[PDB]
Amino acid sequence: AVKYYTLEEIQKHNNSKSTWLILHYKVYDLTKFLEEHPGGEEVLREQAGGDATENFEDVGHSTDARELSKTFIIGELHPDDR
Numbered sequence: 001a002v003k004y005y006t007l008e009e010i011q012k013h014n015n016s017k018s019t020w021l022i023l024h025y026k027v028y029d030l031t032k033f034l035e036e037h038p039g040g041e042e043v044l045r046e047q048a049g050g051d052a053t054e055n056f057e058d059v060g061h062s063t064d065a066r067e068l069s070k071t072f073i074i075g076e077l078h079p080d081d082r
């Protein structure tokens with residue numbers, strides 16, 4: 001099932017490669033995706049250990065990309081956080 005994770009859990013996943021971020025409470029495991037992503041690694045890693053809902057939704061991307069994104073959900077905001 002979804003691995004319920006607090007901001008903390010993501011905040012801990014932020015290293016040179018080790019990259020997690022949040023896109024509407026849902027935690028996206030982009031550590032692999034860095035190298036796949038047409039928008040590169042740097043950006044995602046910079047957003048790492050935080051809610052990048054902002055950056056995804058503000059960049060806007062594409063329906064397809066919005067829907068591709070789901071494949072990287074590992075977790076979601078702790079029921080106290082959420």
Ligand code: HEM
Nearest residue numbers: 028038039043044047052055056059061062065068069072
């Ligand atoms: C987790 C969801 C993500 C997925 C699956 C994803 C997917 C993609 C895809 C498919 C593109 C190509 C353009 C398009 O068709 O939309 C793209 C471009 C891009 N992405 Fe992402 N992305 C994700 C998250 C992010 C985040 C959080 C950032 C910001 C740190 C970001 C920054 C960019 C940038 C700057 C581009 C380049 C736009 C251009 O072509 O000028 N993406 N992404």
